[PDB]
Structure 1
């Protein structure tokens, strides 16, 4: 034609955003990665979605896995390929060798394969094709040069036929060559790399579109998860800074607090409660959750430090009954160790939990707990993640942070997140007359006025009682004042 290059949607959540529209039509896209990275999954999900969303028949060529297996495994995702094969929407072209192999097959098969592929494409009027592990084919006894021709031929013919293809290749080093022979990269018009990077006993799955001749696309790596719903990608760098903002207020669960905040938290806001352990962030979180049920609104409490049972014991001891909250189906407590998964997973679990429960308020007790081990950049990326998702979702969110040092803390957050949050509430110990007292302070509020006083507060069975400031002291921020 006389325009750019049209793309075909893969409907693979996230991918079409990363690829600025999907795969280039009429061309083949190389998808490689190490063992267990999700190559096959991608190739099948590409066909399946093609069928289920646009009724575009697909041909699936397999060189190693058996057709039965391919259909067997797809069930893992509630994928019924066998049905689609019947309806003639999907055709699995078995190209795998037989238990009784034979020599030299690097030419007959090439033209014969295309004949068959072409045959099938024509027979079912296939629009999408995906070849799984073309690597394995010439993995018979070939050199880079021989590999480059065969690929060139394969790609070329498929091009002529006008098939939008997905080719799967295997790697051996997470960051070494892009594909086995170090040739495939240059022969393909489009290249996608699926990575399963180790790093600290944890595994992180990323996807990168290295290149797409003819168009633009997002660059770099993007984390993704393989679930019961297949590949799920999060273009954390694609989320737009177009969050909705209003002047509507909401209570904290603490009236005096609400006063200090100039009338309560904003509905469209992210609040952060920082302080040493014991200061009472976990309390403010409970009082925040309860206030959402007292107004018959649903709230989720993602706890990463205390057990489900403990949260209940301590909550009851502060009055507020969490038991009822759950029965009335207004409050949902999750709970899970940060070590039970990687940030990417957690991010997703938080999201899905939000979708299946339509929360009005969300509270994550201790982001500081989720920052364990993980790198700072990976962490900030997570924070921006859960933070922005909440903002664009009209969900008020309260996040907890435990500073590494009680008293003397010179920075609000060790991880440096305060800049991403709308309202900051700071809890701190104050040594007074040989005793450890607390103090609460509305450090900042973007749209409101808020109290500038550093009020001391006690904790009882009733909960939190915000009293007066220490007007007669100096160096209070430090934790060890000087009475005057």
Structure 2
């Protein structure tokens, strides 16, 4: 048969490893200091005991068992209880403030034999080490030893560089069958943790780097390229909160769709968003406004001057206003918050104000990856998503988005300024709709105390899209 694997039950990993770690073989987990090796090792054992009734041995080489049990209480895992229930054996191989190899393989086997233990975690084998071929042969002996037992091993290894050699010595890499590289890449002044499976001998795996976050629920990996173009798509309509906009969308937005609001600063994106949120609470549905530009304080003042009261919506428990600076974390961290926050609130409508805030400084690819995730998560979860985008230029803009994410959205609302008679008008347009007919008219519109009023088209003008048209 094909190489049998053993599920780790670490969010994402088992999809990246196409099942889990090859059973009976050792797997190297190497990374710089604070990459998540120990955690990868604990979480690996814990889940086997709790879920599969597979006992585990943790082989510490410096961390006192008090501290291992103590660090586990942070993630809400109680190791002490599994010790006292004879399921998890912590095997202190740290020296009190040669016997190595043969002596230790006996000790770890006396424990492997004693607990019927199907899983082992050695952390960190590096600290035992010796020149170049010394680490290779002493290591190899240990791997080949455990393979004879028929036990499945996680081998924490250290690193000095972030994209340097795999291990410390340039040997371990090859001794082991399965190699996992953790990274904590400094991208500007922020840190992006990624896990890569370099090889699993005798089996396929997902290639490349995958981002993850160490939350209070452990390692959470988002398989960026393991989401499936496999979501539901109804014809159920919903209201935008603007009646003339619903008319122009051929009877309102689709429930299962991503809507994009594109225009210069001060064109009315946050007004359409505010409105899009107030419609959900008006029909007794929960909504989340993900603000990254304005504070709750300012989002209420401005909403109340447009006629709508966020307070009664919040108190009724139908509207959550979140608010975060994009620079406060990295994209994976934000994507984590958003997914986390949608689960505990279970809304029918998400709104992010704005994507253009989150694209700042971050690379185009890194940004798009975030957008394929948030767009993709909403789509498969049957949640309507309105995403605001502020164009870098206020006039003469030729591209909808500067990040080029138009092919990812289903519906594009387009706000733009228009200069007539030495004044600055606005002009909404339903630029596209996937499914609906939609109005093809660039209707002028005004904002008041009442909200948005969508009047008539500029029938007697040429080059409306320019920003300074000419009366025909």
Place the TM-score, normalised by the shorter chain, in its bin.
Answer: over 0.9
Query: Helix, strand or coil for the counterpart of 2:224?
Result: coil
Structure 1 Cα separation of the partners of residues 453 and 66 of structure 2:
66
Q: What's the C-alpha RMSD, in Å, of the aligned pairs? A: 0.5
- Determine the C-alpha separation between the residues in 2 that align with 1:407 and 1:472: 20
Secondary structure in structure 2 of the residue aligned to 1:108: coil
Q: Spell out, residue by residue over 1:41-79, the C-alpha distance to the aligned partner (whole angstroms, 9 max, x if none).
A: 000000001111111110000001111101111111011
The match for 1:125 among 88, 94, 116 is: 116
User: Of 424, 434, 441, which residue of structure 2 is paired with 1:446?
Assistant: 434
CA deviation profile, 1:275-325 (whole Å, cap 9, x unmatched): 001000000000000000000000000000000100000000000100000
> Whole-Å Cα distance in 2 between the matches of residues 70 and 340 of structure 1?
30
- Look up the SS of the partner of 2:387 in the other structure: strand
Q: Give the secondary-structure state (helix, strand or coil) at the position aligned to 1:21.
A: coil
CA distance in 2, matches of 1:227, 1:193: 19
Per-residue CA deviation, residues 376-434 of structure 1 (Å, 9 max, x unaligned), is 00000000000000000000000000000011100000000111000000000000101
Post-superposition CA distance 1:303-351 (Å, at most 9, x none): 0000010000000000010000001101111000000000000001000
Q: For residues 120 and 248 of structure 2, what CA distance do their matches in structure 1 show?
A: 62
Deviations 1:180-226 (A, max 9, x none): 00000000000000000002011000000000000000000000000
SS at match of 1:198: strand
After TM superposition, list the pairs within 5 Å mapping 1:464-475 onto structure 2. Answer: 464-475=452-463
Give distance in 1, aligned partners of 2:168 and 2:227.
34
1:482 aligns with 2:450: no
1:186 to 174, 181, 187: 174
Q: 1:113 aligns with which of 95, 104, 121?
A: 104
Cα drift, residue 121 of structure 1: 1.1
Alignment of 1:422 with 2:413, yes or no, is no
Alpha-carbon distance between aligned partners in 1 of 2:395 and 2:441, rounded to the nearest angstrom: 18
Q: What SS does structure 2 have at the residue aligned with 1:42?
A: helix
Cα distance in 1 between the residues matched to 2:441 and 2:236: 24
Partner Cα distance (1:4, 1:251) in 2: 52
Structure 1 residue matching 2:112: 3-state secondary structure: helix
For 1:195, the equivalent position in structure 2 comes to 183
Q: Secondary structure at the match of 1:287?
A: helix
Q: Could you say which residue in structure 1 is the equivalent of 2:443?
A: 455
Where 2:33 maps in the other structure, the secondary structure is coil
- Whole-Å Cα distance in 1 between the matches of residues 53 and 441 of structure 2? 64
- Cα distance in 1 between the residues matched to 2:123 and 2:347: 42
Unaligned runs of 5+ in 2: none
Alpha-carbon deviation of 1:270?
Answer: 0.4
Partner of residue 50, structure 1: 48
* Secondary structure of 2:207's aligned partner: coil
Deviations 1:215-270 (A, max 9, x none): 00000000000000110000011100011101010000000000000000000000
TM-score under structure 1 length normalisation: 0.97
Aligned residues: 472
Give deviations 1:128-178, integer Å, cap 9, x for gaps: 10000100001xxx1110010011000010010011000000001100000
SS, match of residue 135 in structure 1: helix
Give me the whole-angstrom Cα distance separating, in 2, the residues matched to 1:11 and 1:113.
Answer: 29
Distance 1:109 1:369 in 2: 54
Query: For the residues of structure 2 that align with 1:343 and 1:130, how far apart are their CA atoms?
Result: 31
- Per the TM alignment, residue 108 of structure 1 is displaced from its structure 2 partner at its CA by 2.4
Give the equivalent residue in structure 2 for 1:247.
Answer: 235
Give me the whole-angstrom Cα distance separating, in 2, the residues matched to 1:470 and 1:336: 39
CA distance in 1 between counterparts of 2:282 and 2:329 reads 33
The corresponding residue for 1:367 is 355
Looking at structure 1, the residues matched to 220 and 255 of structure 2 have their Cα atoms a distance apart, in angstroms, of: 29
Shift of 1:483: 1.1
User: Structure 2: how far apart are the matches of 1:162 and 1:247?
Assistant: 54
Residues in 2 aligned to 1:320 and 1:122: alpha-carbon distance in whole angstroms: 69
Secondary structure in 2 aligned to 1:150? helix
**SS in structure 1 at match of 2:184:** strand
The answer on whether the counterparts of 2:100 and 2:128 sit within 8 Å (CA) in structure 1 is: no
* Partners of 2:265 and 2:394 within 8 A in 1: yes
How far the C-alpha of 1:4 sits from its partner, in A, is: 1.3
Query: Which whole-Å CA distance do the structure 2 matches of 1:37 and 1:341 have between them?
Result: 17
CA distance in 2, matches of 1:333, 1:392: 23
CA offset digits 1:105-129 (Å, max 9, x no partner): xx42211111111111111111110
